Amino acid sequence: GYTLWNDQIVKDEEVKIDKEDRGYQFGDGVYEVVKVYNGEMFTVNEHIDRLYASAEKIRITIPYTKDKFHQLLHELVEKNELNTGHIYFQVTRGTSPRAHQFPENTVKPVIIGYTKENPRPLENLEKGVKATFVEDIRWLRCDIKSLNLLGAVLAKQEAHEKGCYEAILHRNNTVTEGSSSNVFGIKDGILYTHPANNMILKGITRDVVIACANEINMPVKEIPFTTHEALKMDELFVTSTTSEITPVIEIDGKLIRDGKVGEWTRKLQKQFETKIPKPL
Amino acid sequence: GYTLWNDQIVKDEEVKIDKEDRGYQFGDGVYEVVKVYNGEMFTVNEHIDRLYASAEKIRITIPYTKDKFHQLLHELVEKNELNTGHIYFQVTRGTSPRAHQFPENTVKPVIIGYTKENPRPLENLEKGVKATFVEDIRWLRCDIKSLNLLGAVLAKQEAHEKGCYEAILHRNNTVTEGSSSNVFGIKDGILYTHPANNMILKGITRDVVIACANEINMPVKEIPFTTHEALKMDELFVTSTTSEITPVIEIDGKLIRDGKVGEWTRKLQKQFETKIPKPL
Ligand SMILES: Cc1ncc(COP(=O)(O)O)c(CNc2csc(C(=O)O)c2)c1O
Numbered sequence: 001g002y003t004l005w006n007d008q009i010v011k012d013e014e015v016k017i018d019k020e021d022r023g024y025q026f027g028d029g030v031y032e033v034v035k036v037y038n039g040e041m042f043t044v045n046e047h048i049d050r051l052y053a054s055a056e057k058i059r060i061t062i063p064y065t066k067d068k069f070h071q072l073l074h075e076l077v078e079k080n081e082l083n084t085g086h087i088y089f090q091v092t093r094g095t096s097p098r099a100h101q102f103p104e105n106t107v108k109p110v111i112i113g114y115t116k117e118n119p120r121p122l123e124n125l126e127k128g129v130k131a132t133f134v135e136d137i138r139w140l141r142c143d144i145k146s147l148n149l150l151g152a153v154l155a156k157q158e159a160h161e162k163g164c165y166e167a168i169l170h171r172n173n174t175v176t177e178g179s180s181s182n183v184f185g186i187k188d189g190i191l192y193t194h195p196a197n198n199m200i201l202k203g204i205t206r207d208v209v210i211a212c213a214n215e216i217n218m219p220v221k222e223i224p225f226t227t228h229e230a231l232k233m234d235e236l237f238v239t240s241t242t243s244e245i246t247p248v249i250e251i252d253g254k255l256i257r258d259g260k261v262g263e264w265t266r267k268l269q270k271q272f273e274t275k276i277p278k279p280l
Numbered sequence: 281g282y283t284l285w286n287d288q289i290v291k292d293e294e295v296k297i298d299k300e301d302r303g304y305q306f307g308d309g310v311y312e313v314v315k316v317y318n319g320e321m322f323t324v325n326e327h328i329d330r331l332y333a334s335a336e337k338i339r340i341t342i343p344y345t346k347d348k349f350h351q352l353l354h355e356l357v358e359k360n361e362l363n364t365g366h367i368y369f370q371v372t373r374g375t376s377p378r379a380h381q382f383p384e385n386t387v388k389p390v391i392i393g394y395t396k397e398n399p400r401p402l403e404n405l406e407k408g409v410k411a412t413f414v415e416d417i418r419w420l421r422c423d424i425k426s427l428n429l430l431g432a433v434l435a436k437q438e439a440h441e442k443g444c445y446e447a448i449l450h451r452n453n454t455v456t457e458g459s460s461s462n463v464f465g466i467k468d469g470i471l472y473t474h475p476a477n478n479m480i481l482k483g484i485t486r487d488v489v490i491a492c493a494n495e496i497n498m499p500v501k502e503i504p505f506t507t508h509e510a511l512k513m514d515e516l517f518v519t520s521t522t523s524e525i526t527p528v529i530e531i532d533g534k535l536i537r538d539g540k541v542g543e544w545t546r547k548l549q550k551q552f553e554t555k556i557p558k559p560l
């Protein structure tokens with residue numbers, strides 16, 4: 001395959017990372033993941049906007065305009081002949097002799113991007129998945145989509161060890177988000193999800209789902225709920241660029257209602273399906 | 281010059297880091313810095329022990345014995361002909377297609393180490409430095425010396441822009457540690473420092489300084505203090521492998537006592553001086 005490296009498209013094996021790349025020594029960088037469906041990038045503008053917002057939050061200046069970044073992604077998808085899967089891309093502050101403080105503005109960011117073929121998780125969407133609650137021990141700027149992902153790594157591993165698809169995180173029993181998703185609960189036909197402050201990532205899929213709820217006249221309340229309240233919900237699901245709307249039918253051996261995917265989850269899945277590129 | 285790469289000392293130009301090294305994508309790794317004085321490593325055993333401890337805390341298995349690791353560090357120091365400076369070394373979970381959960385145990389960790397010449401910070405040891413308070417927004421496993429350093433990066437940059445040497449961090453108005461140091465206060469000839477729990481890194485220099493206090497019959501209380509209390513200390517200093525015992529004489533324009541280096545800090549600096557390698 002081919003990898004985007006700065007503004008060049010290069011054979012994968014030509015790409016070399018420096019040991020003093022600040023992404024490698026400090027996790028000093030930001031990233032995005034964009035889903036591609038039948039050759040078309042879904043919500044690419046929103047992801048590019050969020051990459052630049054994440055970068056700006058940690059004062060990294062991306063050296064290309066958004067239009068040029070968009071063009072590069074297009075070229076990367078075409079060169080790799082990606083049909084259905086995702087583009088991963090990240091920006092780090094660059095390479096400089098190791099020191100905590102920022103280097104001279106003479107240092108250029110390092111941009112890496114690549115593709116992976118990866119089907120829609122149709123089985124999960126239909127049947128739902130199991131999850132587990134795990135304490136949120138992450139830093140307090142979860143609104144920045146950074147490469148500092150070690151709390152999420154440990155949470156995901158714990159979930160995978162329990163045979164669960166996702167770890168639902170909580171700060172002293174207040175549900176925040178998933179180790180790599182946003183978390184929604186439904187009760188009495190109302191959609192609940194934690195508000196977008198410094199405690200969660202403002203997911204692109206989260207935002208599409210809220211729009212879907214508005215389109216079908218389902219009330220949305222962006223207020224947090226507890227782990228104990230979550231267990232009493234009528235329906236629960238998680239969202240991400242790759243997981244789409246993935247129903248959660250069981251948490252830690254306790255069924256959500258009857259352990260079946262709920263009616264409102266299905267309605268949202270139906271509205272979501274209208275937004276994604278189809279062949280054709 | 282020469283870089284430790286996995287189990288070999290190679291020319292720096294031979295080192296190849298993969299874009300999917302989990303140190304680069306998740307900050308999934310741990311590290312150490314060791315001071316070398318006139319060719320001799322200081323407290324190297326304690327730093328190797330801490331490296332293995334940090335690794336174990338995130339379930340990385342280092343693929344060779346502590347004896348082997350010590351051997352490789354000695355060779356690294358000789359090949360580079362390091363006089364006075366430091367060795368940096370890190371271990372990541374390894375290279376694997378991108379996924380939050382751990383890869384299979386077939387994946388070897390990546391070890392990178394290199395040297396830098398860096399003199400003792402003479403001026404700071406003598407004259408003391410300025411510091412600034414910065415709210416501690418880092419994750420809740422600060423006892424692990426991980427590559428997830430973005431909180432510390434932003435804190436140090438804040439200090440540097442205000443012309444300060446160090447950011448002194450505080451969580452719930454309680455002083456924890458510095459962005460890259462531990463913090464000690466002295467009041468009425470007693471030495472105070474935050475206890476070694478999940479809120480701070482248990483510094484090697486910190487432990488040496490506590491040993492030194494014991495040797496000069498100075499009482500030590502590992503009890504945390506607030507920002508308000510810090511400003512009322514008789515003396516204040518920070519410790520790290522490269523800072524040694526750096527007096528702090530002002531925080532945010534407020535002088536610590538008279539803004540002079542205090543008598544107890546000098547006594548501790550003198551005691552510390554007896555521990556460093558001296559081949560005359
Ligand atoms: C902490 C946290 N919260 C929410 C999300 C969801 O964000 P969007 O992908 O919807 O923008 C994410 C992104 N997760 C994610 C993106 S692709 C993917 C995967 O499993 O492949 C996962 C996250 O890391």
Ligand SMILES: Cc1ncc(COP(=O)(O)O)c(CNc2csc(C(=O)O)c2)c1O
Pocket residue numbers: 313432457458459460461462480481482483484485486519520521522523
């Ligand atoms: C958050 C945090 N707390 C305490 C320390 C001090 O630990 P020791 O270096 O004493 O083991 C450190 C390590 N600091 C440090 C080591 S080398 C260095 C430098 O300025 O070069 C700095 C740290 O990062």
